[PDB]
Automatic annotation (TrEMBL), chains A, B, C, D:
This is Pteridine reductase. The modification Cysteine sulfenic acid (-SOH) is found at residues 58, 72, 150. Substrate binds at residue 137. Keywords: Nucleotide-binding, Oxidoreductase. It comes from Trypanosoma brucei brucei. The keyword Nucleotide-binding applies. The keyword Nucleotide-binding applies. The active site is at 143 (proton donor/acceptor), 156 (proton donor/acceptor), 156 (proton acceptor). Pfam families: adh_short_C2. NADPH binds at residues 13-14, 34-36, 61-63, 92, 94, 156, 160, 189-190. NADP(+) binds at residues 12-14, 34-36, 61-63, 92, 94, 156, 160, 187, 189-190. One of its GO terms (molecular function) is nucleotide binding. SUPFAM superfamilies: NAD(P)-binding Rossmann-fold domains (SSF51735).
Length: 250, 250, 250, 250
């Protein structure tokens, strides 16, 4: 029987590449998505064409609210429903936008989105994963630039720091159950869609190793390692995949 | 005129010692409290006996909710209404209790309390402090053991990691306004009074420097340094006040 | 055709496991040794029996001295002479013993061995490797307990901290040359042969992940990942392989 | 009776500022120097004119060699000879120059100077200070940019990382003796004398807090705090004094 993985925010970009690589490794996959229904369904079709009954989609908003625990329980439940097991959780989904401290969304909505997607949903997904329970593990998508943050991104940065805390606390608490918990911390990978070309090139030029952003596949490679049998003694570790970017001074 | 400071969770323990030392240094103080009204008022009365019209109290729940931004705006406003200025914000208030990942508050109440008091309220207070604006600074009460956490304290640890992120992000963003943002990270300080001495001693014996916990006054001393003229180039720094505890392996 | 790797201290324990695994992956190997000639030659015999002329030995003392730069140049040169190329350098050799601050070898001998083997030899080897130059990389064997050090191990700890600095500095400086530089940080792996069984078990019980030390092969697996095509965007990263030990408070 | 302090590299710049501020606080001081004899004697003369018999000079090369332990023992002995006690050691002296990995002094001379002054001399001074033994403490001058290093400064950066390790290891080991060990980590403070103004301004513009380097007095203020009674529970802490520089991404 093939193991099964949940990947959040898996319709596009890094999450898609993670879901593809897990599937290529032998996993059955739950493709979680929020708005990107067409892309999620299209990915599941492509994976199922390769091996039937190995991919399903699961829609959920990961914004914090009093129903977020139920949504997170449902995502894990969807994996058990489709595949009878859940071996791997990848917390990839993320909201990312500025929240300046000095002055259409209310600040409480920004808190719910940025802290919910980046930290609270990973926590609740981790609880549900552990409670519903080989080679079990969780991989959190962190941020290599967490200590040299983007100006005016305080709530985003707070959420990603909270995710480091979750990675460490859950590694400690879940180790006696044989569940490893680790992180992968990109520097600059696939650049935002809204961003212009001259700006993208500015960021590319900062990266010591090759003066280019990471491909989604390069990020997924670190995820694959961490869920593999080659990482069985690794827990609580966060692997930077940043081309040296976090080493570069102002 | 005398400068003014807001101290959250100032009725008892570390926040009380901070408020007293700031007052002794010459600050007028807003004593924020949640449940401890008698203690808050007793402190205000003691400080006003020392110097008239130098202390007020401000009640607020710092749990996350739709009204938290308004509450935090009101806390800052209370300092301006009482004293005509707000020079110092000390984010001291904190909820602290276990939240195990594996199995009478709901998990979302625990999120609201632990992430709200430890991280979101500091963020909203920081926004309101900056918007309302010399030696201006913010001091956040962090935790020296954030990377070697208590078992089953994931939400607490997430909140304290988020607070490190806020300290760094806000230092960067507020530096152009001349507002410094720093942290003080206790190891073991005041223990619960109801905790058996035999249990308190297990903690005390872990501390390399003197085999004792920090007094509240020793924590307050680092706060006083950070708000002083002797720290005018210090921003984004977190000072451990832990007797070497964080250096001790398992 | 086949790439080539230098592994220092490769005759026994972790270095041996690294050498075996690199060989199994298709590398030709230089097995460096200081005192363990018999063991080095026995390993080379084993590897050459598998694939002829794919393993050579190289003697050198890695103690700091006037001749250490020449010795390090020779180690790198041996790889180029045997195999025509040098793709991977693994700085694994180490000295480990206490150096109490409050009171055999003179203290300056301890400096030469602890700082020399653990930090200066890696620096000189890195220089020689880079000067003599595809998937090129260096892997430094670090220590996951670097910030929670063993009592009375100051010089050892200083050396391992220096090695973190070299990993980061060399990653930055060598990135333009396409040379990646990373670390693997064991917690408790193969215990010193001198250490008694009760002391071994005492350390084992502290590890969250299965209450056991890492095998040498688990350490080697992380090295294999970092030198692989799956790590081509990773530079300046140190992967802990410690079963969660560094997360455990006193 | 007045307490006494040793400051290494105290003839000029930050070391002079530390010596002056310690003297103004009421310490008797040993002004260590290497080449700057006129400047050292001039400073001691100024201090002795303020309060007679409160300053002496002590010449020593802190480059690593087989006599460095005796030199470090002598610096400490000079404080006992002059003043009958030694309460504070400030490890300020430092060599700083590039050591490129890819191509006057031999590499072994560069190792001896950069690792000797920045790490081994602090280690040997720490040993002699502890063995010769109230409010006793050691303060090490570290570097806030240790994890975002200057290009081609590997040996310097290895030495400052080793000094972090010493700070932590010595804090742990000397805590039972009541000796606190801490660090102060400048970002950019007094720019090199040989640096032209245009290059100085490039660095100044990077600093979030005021777009200027730290004054020597600002660095000394943090040293004064760490030696004071207001830091009596602080050990193993490194206080950044960097105006937010280390938080600024590439
Ligand atoms: N890209 C980089 O350079 C970079 C750098 C550092 C860290 N990272 C981290 O790596 C991960 C992947 O990066 P990425 O650039 O691929 O991410 P992304 O494109 O910004 O976001 C990934 C997905 O997150 C989902 N998402 C957003 N808000 C959500 C909500 N309220 N509920 C549920 N899902 C939501 C979206 O799903 P739908 O499209 O279905 O709505 C989105 O496609 C993220 O955790 C990110 O923080 C990336
Ligand atoms: N004590 C230690 O050993 C230690 C160790 C590490 C870190 N720290 C940090 O140092 C700081 C002070 O420690 P402490 O031991 O003095 O803290 P504490 O006694 O646990 O709590 C301080 C105050 O926080 C306020 N608070 C709690 N929940 C609140 C809510 N929902 N809304 C508003 N206020 C709330 C309470 O005020 P009322 O009483 O008025 O309700 C309480 O008296 C905290 O940030 C803590 O995390 C302490
Ligand atoms: N084992 C662990 O639990 C652990 C934990 C943390 C970090 N590490 C790190 O992982 C790496 C490997 O650990 P290990 O336990 O396998 O190491 P080890 O057995 O202590 O030493 C490995 C080899 O280093 C060589 N070596 C020592 N001093 C030398 C000198 N002056 N000149 C030349 N070579 C010298 C020796 O080679 P010869 O026998 O040929 O003389 C020795 O066999 C080390 O860097 C270590 O610091 C290990
Ligand atoms: N300046 C900055 O921006 C900055 C930034 C980060 C860290 N720091 C750290 O802060 C401390 C003070 O900085 P600084 O700029 O004032 O230092 P500095 O001027 O570069 O050096 C201070 C003194 O070190 C002594 N020294 C150098 N080589 C020596 C040797 N072989 N033996 C004995 N003494 C030697 C010299 O004494 P003589 O003149 O008597 O020969 C020199 O005056 C240093 O530890 C430095 O690394 C400074
Ligand atoms: N461009 C970046 O550095 C960056 C950082 C974080 C991040 N998180 C996302 N969800 S997209 C994204 C982009
Ligand atoms: N005993 C401790 O180490 C500890 C840590 C954090 C904390 N936060 C509070 N609000 S009380 C408290 C106690
Ligand atoms: N017992 C350990 O945890 C340990 C730590 C470091 C180390 N370095 C060596 N060369 S052997 C060794 C063992
Ligand atoms: N320019 C700097 O940031 C800088 C850094 C370190 C340092 N160390 C010295 N001895 S002078 C000096 C200057």
């Amino acid at each position: 029987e093939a193991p099964a993985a949940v990947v959040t925010g898996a319709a596009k970009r890094i999450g898609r590449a993670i879901a593809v690589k897990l599937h290529q490794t032998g996993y059955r996959v739950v493709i979680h998505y929020h708005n990107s229904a067409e892309a999620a369904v299209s990915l599941a079709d492509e994976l199922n064409k390769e091996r039937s009954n190995t991919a399903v989609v699961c829609q959920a908003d990961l914004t914090n609210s009093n129903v977020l625990p139920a949504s997170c329980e449902e995502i894990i439940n969807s994996c058990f429903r489709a595949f009878g097991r859940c071996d791997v959780l990848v917390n990839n989904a993320s909201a990312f936008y500025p929240t300046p401290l000095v002055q259409g969304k209310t600040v409480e909505t920004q808190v719910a989105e940025l802290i919910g997607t980046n930290a609270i949903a990973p926590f609740l997904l981790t609880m549900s994963f552990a409670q519903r329970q080989s080679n079990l593990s969780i991989v959190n998508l962190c941020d290599a630039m967490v200590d040299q943050p983007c100006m005016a991104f305080s709530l985003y940065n707070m959420g990603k720091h909270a995710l480091v805390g979750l990675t460490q606390s859950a590694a400690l608490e879940l180790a006696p159950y044989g569940i490893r918990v680790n992180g992968v911390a990109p520097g600059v990978s696939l650049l935002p869609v809204a961003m212009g070309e001259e700006e993208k090139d500015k960021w590319r030029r900062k990266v010591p190793l090759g003066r280019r952003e990471a491909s989604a596949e390069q990020i997924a490679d670190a995820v694959i390692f961490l869920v593999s049998g080659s990482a069985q003694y690794i827990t609580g570790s966060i692997i930077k995949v940043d081309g040296g970017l976090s080493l570069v001074h102002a």
